Amino acid sequence: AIRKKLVIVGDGACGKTCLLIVFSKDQFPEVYVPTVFENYVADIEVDGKQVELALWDTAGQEDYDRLRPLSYPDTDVILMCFSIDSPDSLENIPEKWTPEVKHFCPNVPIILVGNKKDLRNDEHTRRELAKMKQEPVKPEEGRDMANRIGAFGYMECSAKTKDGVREVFEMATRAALQ
Amino acid sequence: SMEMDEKDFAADSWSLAVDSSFLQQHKKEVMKQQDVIYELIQTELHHVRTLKIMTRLFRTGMLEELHLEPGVVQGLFPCVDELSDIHTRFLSQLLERRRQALCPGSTRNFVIHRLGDLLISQFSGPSAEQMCKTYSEFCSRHSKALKLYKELYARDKRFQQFIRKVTRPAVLKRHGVQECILLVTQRITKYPLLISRILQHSHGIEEERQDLTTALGLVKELLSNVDEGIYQLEKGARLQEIYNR
Numbered sequence A: 001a002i003r004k005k006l007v008i009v010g011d012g013a014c015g016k017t018c019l020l021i022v023f024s025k026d027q028f029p030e031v032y033v034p035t036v037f038e039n040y041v042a043d044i045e046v047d048g049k050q051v052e053l054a055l056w057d058t059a060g061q062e063d064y065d066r067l068r069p070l071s072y073p074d075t076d077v078i079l080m081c082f083s084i085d086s087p088d089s090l091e092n093i094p095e096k097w098t099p100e101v102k103h104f105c106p107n108v109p110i111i112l113v114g115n116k117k118d119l120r121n122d123e124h125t126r127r128e129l130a131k132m133k134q135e136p137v138k139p140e141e142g143r144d145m146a147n148r149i150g151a152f153g154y155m156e157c158s159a160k161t162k163d164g165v166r167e168v169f170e171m172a173t174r175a176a177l178q
Numbered sequence B: 001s002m003e004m005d006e007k008d009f010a011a012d013s014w015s016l017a018v019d020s021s022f023l024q025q026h027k028k029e030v031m032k033q034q035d036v037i038y039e040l041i042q043t044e045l046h047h048v049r050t051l052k053i054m055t056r057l058f059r060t061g062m063l064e065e066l067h068l069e070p071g072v073v074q075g076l077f078p079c080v081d082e083l084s085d086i087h088t089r090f091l092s093q094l095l096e097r098r099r100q101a102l103c104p105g106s107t108r109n110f111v112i113h114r115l116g117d118l119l120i121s122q123f124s125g126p127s128a129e130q131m132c133k134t135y136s137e138f139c140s141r142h143s144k145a146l147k148l149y150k151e152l153y154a155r156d157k158r159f160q161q162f163i164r165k166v167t168r169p170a171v172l173k174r175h176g177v178q179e180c181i182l183l184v185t186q187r188i189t190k191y192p193l194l195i196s197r198i199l200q201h202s203h204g205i206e207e208e209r210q211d212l213t214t215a216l217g218l219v220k221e222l223l224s225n226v227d228e229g230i231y232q233l234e235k236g237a238r239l240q241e242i243y244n245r
């Protein structure tokens, strides 16, 4: 297998840690959801090619501008996350996360990922957002931002129900192979 | 890691580690608090273990089996002895706090009610100064270490064979040289996430909520100081490139 490296970036409440935990764990965390993610080396077979994909989180590094870039060396694919229940996490993508990743990871494919897609049809989420003149991120709003920032592609998933999780990591492997 | 500690931290959580008859005797809030304290100790155990792989497996194996130029092994594993000393002592205190709290007749049933004070001690005074100086040095030498590793792996056959041999076992899957370096750099930024979640479930005793709030503040000051003290070293960087920063 060829070795590839993946790093997930995004705001503190974007759901990046939960996404890495659910993908890596063999059994879903029904008793305890871990606070942090150390690292993992996933065995993935995509389109007939065997890859060892090493997974890394940037959670905890959001406020430390000189510590955070040390996670970037030799990255082959970036998952850039936002939460669908947080339109404010989408607005930070183009002028905060995108220029940083393009500077430290030139030519590295970025997949923009909309997490917590299950909250798009959650009444509590819709009521809370409606108090700040907001609504859950629309599918076209995600695609348009991905198009604008020069992302390799746009995908959506739910770490809670597991829907879309496998497809995100299999597509990340294909991007890393290009 | 030693077998005694691995078995004590083998379960996915505190609620799965203790006996179910002991678990049933506690309130949900106590269980939530204990599950996060257990994760902090379990990840500290794994972090000290990463430092042992770096010093004993990699560093020592290179000195005893390879003929590398002087000061090359130091460049690959900067501050590893100092880091191991800081974290082994911290782990010792965390493990003794759990051990003191075990019920008589049990090696697995315990509740830690007073973690805040231990965290204030670790993240204040001389021990905090040592952590700040050591991580400022380590994180400033991080890129240099990865480049030196990549150079040696590409040009030295015996170095390539040594790495492939010692990293072949399945238990080393996540612990290659470059993975260990990033695991260590990322460790310090895990602390505020763990402490904030422990604090979220430690409101029952006001003295404990206060101590954890103080510990959280101390960790953040330490991280801010480390972040401000970083400047990446580069092999062959000229003085002109440095003073024109």
Ligand SMILES: NC(=O)c1ccc(NC(=O)[C@@H]2CCCO2)cc1
Pocket: A022, A023, A025, A043, A044, A045, A046, A162, A165, A166, A167, A169, A170
């Ligand atoms: N193509 C592969 O080698 C492959 C790797 C991993 C998976 N599993 C998952 O992605 C799911 C996601 C939640 C639990 O496991 C499936 C296939």
